[PDB]
Symmetry: C5
């Protein structure tokens, strides 16, 4: 029998954690097994006057009088759930002239938590990517640190995953924003209690507030998308600059090797005559006392002359 | 006379396989030859109150009282058709409080089978691509394994084909979702029996359930599209990293070759004087007992001195 | 006086070819010179109850009682026009229970001919591109065949032109599909004879059949677009693989050249002492009978020792 | 006081050029300074029953009874304005059965002039780009002509500017086409004279003719956009082919240099023993008359043997 | 207690700067803390008949009778605010026949200031990018200046940020333009004073003027977007040209090094026989007076012959 771990938050901020089976939870919440499947990483749906919304590892169901967190154990949710969420859900402080229903505060808190996690992911990825790209770009080494290439690849993969997460968050919010029926379905207290909504319709709950809230969070996600796209474009531009760094530095060694090759070729060409005169044969010139010094001087001078003439060749032909 | 191989599933899950001609099948189904052409890899159409839908090798026609599978032989469909489809079509288990008509279950089963095949293709492609890219990226070899390049190319081609398949599946579902007339055409039992629909309109069959089903499968296909796009982006990023791996490692050998070229050039330059003094001529210095050792020491020391001076050159010019 | 070469097909499939001037043709067809300009490669328009449609070299005007082909000479249209089009336009065979008007058959025949030509272009381009990319990708040669690069470039240009042709064909069909007024304008016989349409409105001619026909041809063109896009993506991926093939193979020769450079540098370094002892001077060691063999053995052993020590250098520094 | 140079074309094709101030021109035309600012490169607006439209250097205002060209001096407009525009505006020839108002002819003439200039720019850019890419692609040279790279870069920049111009022209036409109010605003004579329009509504001026005219020019601009996009794709493909041309040809020289390095390494390795036996020491073998020839033969044969063995190495290791 | 620095502009252009707390400012403006959060870089909203709009560092709130600038200190706004904004807000000069309300002038002034700042950013970035790309592209150096690569990278990052800023400015303007309710909300004086609007409805304030103003600024931002996109495309094309510059120049040094390698290989091959005859052994040919000169001539001639034969090899094999 599959089971759910449920953390229930009341309208007063009270936190109660219990242990209830899935089949009993369906009857308690007035839902069916197909509603609480949680097979989508980003989904915000309203089934049977219950707001069922999921963000990766954050699965929550919002009821008119309570908020439930499902499958929260061993997911680093032990700090926010018991020290930040009750404060936001209790309604302490803030503007008391227009207290919105519980579902509005629950949706706002969950959306803010997800936007904060996305902002933290981006603000962790950005400095690492910047510090990795600021070292490979620098033209003070012939090659790049091969150890940092794996770090760059992992950071790029994480950035792609973060971009996908922000894109699906934006799509999920925009789906509710565009369709007026979907946005009106979020008014759980209106349909659950159609007699209090008319009496308390003095700005307490209306489509304008939900429109503004969802637009604010969609704009925050759009800002995050713009920042992530800028970071990815920066990664691509830095890689293109590195491609020029490893090619322009190679040409320097090409030129040095070519110059040394000309030098050693001239040296070998003029030492060829020395080897020819070095054979143990009869050259008919061993009696002369000036031929040796003349040959040595000719060799040494012509080596430099041919080296300079060849050095002019690479300066002429580019 | 062209023929069809038909596998018929009744409302009770009974499986009957027979052998009927195309012309007789058109009369039996009340269709024409143009409807059952199956020239599109992904198409879901409703012609003459019959749901004609095709997924690559899966050609099926859904009738109010039966489901037909056409051209199923020799396509690895001998396990699902006779061991999984009857269980899903029989309606055993699940929620008995709202049994939907047969066409809903048939569409759900076919869509789930195609989404499962796409998920299997993706979950087969992903580990191979990851293990191929994790070996070429590693900077422990001067070159990359040329055998794995063909594997990477074939995996990329398969990923492109899978992306096209998921894209056309999403388009086929979204075409039905967007147009309300197309979605209403799926209610085959409503138009076939317009007198039972009104009596059994207590949540048994309505547009909401089909909207939710098609949205669920479109969202599953969208998740698969996101995963495939992430994999393709990872492939491109890994190829860009390999391009830096094969260029930064080349520069290391460039530097080593340049250093050795400077060393051998200095050695040849200082051995030139040894060759000059090695000729079988009169150098006017053979009588001295210290000129040979002085020349040898000068040669050996100046070789290292010129080598160090040239080694400073590549450290100065980057 | 500009002239037109007209091939006229009657409702009975009769083919009559005559020679009529443009000015007289305008009066005969009830059109103006601006209608029959044919300045667009892909255009399907209905002017003055005449369907004027053009596909590159295929210019045709459809009339209620006849179909005209304009400028057909010397364009390889001498086989289809007189051996395939009359059979399709005669209405022989097929379903006789619902004979559509002549304009429907003419539009279907022209659209099918263009889709067949596009399919032939794609099925000619694909094998050549595949066989060209299967040879350069193979890592059995240091370089790639430079002759096949021009073939690849021409095939890529032809693929781009084919993609543009399919894109404009899809756009032309979708323009008619989206606007209901444009699709209703195709019912030439309805507006020409508003008294037979009502009497023969028993499924003979209605918007459903034209919608299905145009959707079928748009889906065929979409399949061709998907295939062409897959081929282009394959071309790009294969080029990226070749870029790794010509860079990883270069590193192999880099390593071999570096190893040989270390070997020859060690050989020169240890032959330097042999050259130093080879001078025609007084080394004060010519009387010893063991110095020569000791020096030779030291040279030969130290050459290999230094070669191994340098070979360890490239294995340590990657 | 800022001034305007105005060229006025009457309904009879008369050309009058005068010199009027901006402030007086505003009163004469019944406009304000904000209307005649001409700060947009591509804009077609109708302000106060006056069609104010601008195309880069072509600024014109269309009035019910006249057409004005503003700032035409020193812009190579001295041929079209006084030798082509009056002929088109006079209405000579053409179809006299349906003469449209003056504003239609003026808009058609200006749009045709701009489309002709864009076509000329494209037909000038295309041959130069083709002839530049047909020389660098050819694999008959080790390198590419560095002089033609600047020509290619300038042609690419000009192609990008032309693509932007055609894109903004298409956007300007489509803005009028999509909104029916904007298209109806072009009927200047209808609003200026609401009593002649009803009497002369027998096909002289209606929305159909303007729709067809703007659609024709939008389709011409779309054809130009397709051609420019094909040219840009061809440029990118040719650059990718050149990248393979400069890398596959480098590998040929790599292989030749490696082969020569093996040859010279074998030569040095076997000449090491000759240098060792060439020292001026006691080798204890000078008395033998066959050791010298044996050593020389061993050297010469082993040089080739080691060269062949090393040549097998690059054939084994790819 | 958080505080705001407010610069208040009256309808007469008077500038008053004071120091008011956020909580008191909310009561004075009739707003709440959630309205004046300024968490979006580009946002234009109308809350409680107050136009709250922000552009990066420019935060302003527009009231029916005054304009407030918030957080203006130490942001280089001390020149425009006190020397340009009062002149524009005073309404001096211009067309006095149709004076629009204060909110129109304030929105126009703020939008013009932001468009001027964006134009200045673009006109500063463009010359630097052009001068940087005009030096690396030039094929007069083997390598590119590594110092200018960092300048190019920083300029590319700044261009990406500018493109994002212009994109979000265009989106913010288009959001107001598309929705008629949002544009009507900008008429602050209409809702604040619903009795003066009807009396002064003689062209003083209507939707047409705001539509034209927002369209003008959206078109200016679109021109800036086109220019920035052209600059980015130019950057990419120039980088692609540099990639050919550093590869075609490398091949020149490849060819020179190969030619010198052939020369030195021929020299070593023919000096091998000189070394063989140079050994201190019995060659049985020392008595001949012509063998030495013959060997030397053969060596010198065959060196050049083999060099030419090898030079033909690279001319044959490309
Ligand atoms: Mg080398
Ligand atoms: Mg050497
Ligand atoms: Mg000697």
């Amino acid at each position: 029998a599959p089971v759910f771990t449920v953390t229930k938050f009341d309208k007063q901020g009270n936190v109660t954690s219990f242990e209830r089976k899935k089949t009993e939870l369906y009857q308690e919440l007035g839902l069916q097994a197909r509603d609480l499947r949680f097979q989508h990483v980003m989904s915000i749906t309203v089934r049977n006057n219950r707001i069922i919304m999921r963000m990766e590892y954050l699965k929550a169901v919002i009821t008119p009088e309570c908020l439930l967190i499902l499958d929260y154990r061993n997911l680093n949710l032990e700090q926010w759930l018991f020290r930040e969420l009750p404060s936001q859900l209790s309604g302490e402080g803030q503007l008391v002239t227009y207290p919105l229903p519980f579902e509005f505060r629950a949706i706002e808190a969950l959306l803010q938590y997800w936007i904060n996690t996305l902002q933290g992911k981006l603000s962790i990825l950005q400095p690492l990517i910047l510090e990795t790209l600021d070292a490979l770009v620098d033209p003070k080494h012939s090659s790049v640190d091969r150890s940092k290439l794996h770090i760059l690849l992992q950071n790029g993969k994480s950035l792609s995953e973060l971009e996908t997460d922000i894109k699906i968050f934006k799509e999920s919010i925009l789906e509710i924003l565009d369709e007026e029926e979907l946005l009106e379905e979020l008014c759980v207290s209106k349909w659950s209690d159609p007699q209090v909504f008319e009496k308390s319709s003095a700005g307490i709950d209306h489509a304008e507030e939900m429109e503004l809230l969802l637009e604010n969070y969609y704009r925050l996600a759009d800002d995050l998308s713009n920042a992530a796209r800028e970071l990815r474009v920066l990664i691509d531009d830095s890689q293109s600059i590195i491609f020029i760094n490893l090619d322009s530095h190679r040409n320097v060694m090409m030129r040095l090797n070519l110059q040394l090759t000309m030098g050693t070729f001239s040296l070998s060409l003029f030492g060829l005559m020395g080897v020819a005169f070095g054979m143990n044969l009869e050259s008919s010139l061993e009696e002369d006392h000036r031929i040796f010094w003349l040959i040595t001087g000719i060799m040494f001078m012509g080596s430099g002359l041919i080296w300079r003439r060849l050095l002019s060749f690479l300066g002429r032909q580019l």
